[model samples]
Target: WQPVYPMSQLSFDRILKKDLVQGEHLGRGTRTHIYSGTLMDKKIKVILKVLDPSHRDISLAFFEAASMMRQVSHKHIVYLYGVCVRDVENIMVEEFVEGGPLDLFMHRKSDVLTTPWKFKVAKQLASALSYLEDKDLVHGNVCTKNLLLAREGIDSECGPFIKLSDPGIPITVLSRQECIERIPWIAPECVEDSKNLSVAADKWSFGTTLWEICYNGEIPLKDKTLIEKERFYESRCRPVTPSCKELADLMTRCMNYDPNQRPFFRAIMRDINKLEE
Candidate 1:
């Protein structure tokens, strides 16, 4: 309907939006620009996702994501705090989890983690995803990059604090390309059938995340960049290293060639929670 940030003159941010007077830009999408800013004079760290109305037709989909955020309030899910209409463009202000994506932090930082930390993190993801299912919402884009931690958990002020960001994409609409790049964490049905994307698919992606942590961020097809990952699935037989054998086995179950074969997120969550005990 109305643009979130509806003012041409009000749109004056630089690349990083950390500077309020300048209104910076943190990142740019095909039809959006992300920025970091604050609200209510608090240390309001956030990602400002803005879109142009006419050319940036993506606002509708993102708006749905934003609206979805309002409806689904889980600790793991990113919060959509503010929506502004500046002219035809709308700006979505989402909580900015400082620790960064789990992928970025996974590079050689094992010293900072607890023993067998990968499984523990996996457990947190299961908790988050299970929470999502409670809302009857499917986080179509369930990737490590989307998971966030809340400061309230893990005994740390800085956190994804055990949070999961829902990409909210439906599996039926996902392209074969999306399935392939997403396969490393996707359920096998997501890869094989393409129609079997639901909580099971999220479980597939969730397990892939655990695979990344256990593999020290270098899981199968780890050699490929994001772009390459899309087409790399021409062959699905990638190897899982010794470190991730337990996780790899579970991951294959999620990535099962058959949707019927994959376990539900709740089932996986129970097994994951036991990993620490």
Candidate 2:
């Protein structure tokens, strides 16, 4: 099921130089860095992500994402052309997005996380997700920074280009880790000690992404700590939510306390499609 341009096509070291142009630093990470670059003499930029072999165990997140990328290919997605694994460390080279993250960039323009424009973005993101669901995979992390905002025509009825990146899966397969890092976006079913991930968990986080973007990147529990985030968002964040009234009904369904009540990606995307008509 791997795509023609899957991430495994090149080694980490080779991809880093081949894909990117020698421009300013676009972004940096603990193990690697990214800069603007040209490939095949084409001005289109690429992301050069590298991993440290010495500190490999700590960054399994990248490897898991690489594994998932090998599963399917979608235009809206950030293409991972190749990867390298050295001494338990892995690095991946990816395609770059021009507009950057959707939530952050959009708020720079105006404060409409949940309006007409928000709906357009939400719908397009849903469509991409529909493609993912068709392949039986889920975007473990669906948030503002994780979303790429592509620029197109003003008359356009969709978001930049809804992408799925930064996959946050379990530290190990068929097991769970009590990591607090991803607690904010994680659902409460994880509290029951059943830490195995499923479409339902991602759906829960997906709903939050839609809410945060539609509400101008403002989570209902804004500026709150992890303890505060878990407390308020889980129980007290209720009664039609009082804030995003327009989409409260939809938001709550996505934030369903019971995971089983959550909507499938197909259902969510179809409903968003209805928002257009």
Candidate 3:
């Protein structure tokens, strides 16, 4: 007998486990394992992230549930195809980005991310953030690794562009590998209580993400003492800025102590677009 797979309003019973072919493992989160695979029915590249069956909890289930309701769509954001949480483990299907994560791309480049491309990357992400903010959703995780790259299409004149991925979930549910490294990207308030996260927290993380891009994917706050953190807490110390004054100032504004003072994503997008001028 075929098992029944349940979904919210959106339903997908066509994806049978027997027809699923798993390839190389892409990455892992706290309870999730990502893999590159091809659906035998469609025979197209798909990213399959499966949550640990043993740890299936309400929050994790809520992640898939929230995704069903929103079904986010944007050019600069990864598209969530569908989610399956049924007789089998919870699996989230997303569009496969061929160029892979942005972290690897920046590190491999010797002289790339030139001025134009730098602004290009920032603009795309800023616009993507704006879209999410409009939808009243917060992308709790905003880091270089979470940002992916892919061509607009095979024939598009533009080079690789950024596509923000992994949305519609609480950051806490993310794999330990993905979330542990995210502290420096978090705002001071969120460091203590992640539930404090809001659009402002996204701004704080976005500032750190821009720092990562500007510094060629350097890890934020690599090694710091507890004493230093005290000072950072009191003074709201931010990472050292790169030489790009305009963007540097914008990043500074984003890292402001008061969430209310942070520029909206639309304002951030405007500033990034001006960098080309």
Candidate 4:
């Protein structure tokens, strides 16, 4: 049985479907289809993640998500506004970030990404990971796909930053194909047994994410097939060493075959801080 907690006070009883003008479809997740919308009187742009009704026994899931978001606070992590549960399904409302995923940022804004921004990306991601570590939680899906770039105000050589989105949402709910497709981010142990995920799993993904960002969105071992990826991890091979010795060293340590050998997020942050200097 799930532990009970105080019920959420922020109800959307007053918020009606008319209050929101749903615009373009943002994207689809394992069990959610996101859409862009603006609140009529609230003067806010919002993201509505309409949960799949077929996956209807999600009251517990919603409760857990809401509880986690309420307790966690980090600028890089996506902020949850509230949830609207209807007779048919549930709708998750979150702050709408203007920019797209980090992969797109690396492609489109490649010129603007100076050394400082790259270092800042490393730091920001580390900051988010560290926050999750502090709460004893793992952001299982720490990949370029899950990192969203958000534009705050103006455009400059030094500009808007990346934010963490679609953080680990119950792997149990994900389909086999969903798990298989994320092979690049999955740790070796997780590949062997997906249910074996832990904070160490995030460390492996974090290292790969760093590789992607540092190389400006290049896939790890680009020519390898999915089967080859599984074998790649089983063989204990890692991505090409980053040019930055500090970064290269961290990546090596992070992707250690033995999860116990991997460093904590705090240690990873310190390594990044050294590079920032």
TM-score of each: 0.71, 0.75, 0.83, 0.84
lDDT of 3 by residue, 196-260 (tens): 66778889888888888888777777776555554665676788887877668878998988888
Instruction: Identify the runs in model 4 with alpha carbons over 4 angstroms from their true place.
Output: 1-18, 56-63, 152-160, 221-225
Which prediction has more favorable lDDT, 2 or 4?
4
The weakest ten consecutive residues by lDDT in model 3 span 1-10
- Per-candidate local distance difference test: 0.59, 0.59, 0.71, 0.72
Instruction: Give every collision pair in model 3.
Output: 29-175, 30-175, 30-176
| Best of the two (3, 4) by lDDT | 4
Over the stretch 66-91, how does candidate 2's per-residue lDDT look in tens digits?
76765556766677765644445355
On the 0 to 100 scale, the lDDT of residue 258 in model 3 is 86
157: Cα error in model 2, Å: 8.7
Clashing pairs in 4: none
Per-residue lDDT of 220-252 in model 1, one digit per residue for the tens? 675676556644444554346435666777776
RMSD of each: 6.5, 4.5, 5.3, 3.4
Clashes of each: 35, 10, 3, 0
Instruction: Report the lDDT tens digits of candidate 4 across residue range 1-277.
Output: 1324534554666456667667789777766788887877647998877777754445456545655664567999988776666567667777887787778668776666665566677778889988888777766778887787786222565555778875534554555556666766777777667677777888888888888877887777777667777677667787778786666777777888888888999988877777666
Superior candidate under lDDT, 1 versus 3: 3
- Ranked by TM-score, the better of candidates 1 and 2 is 2
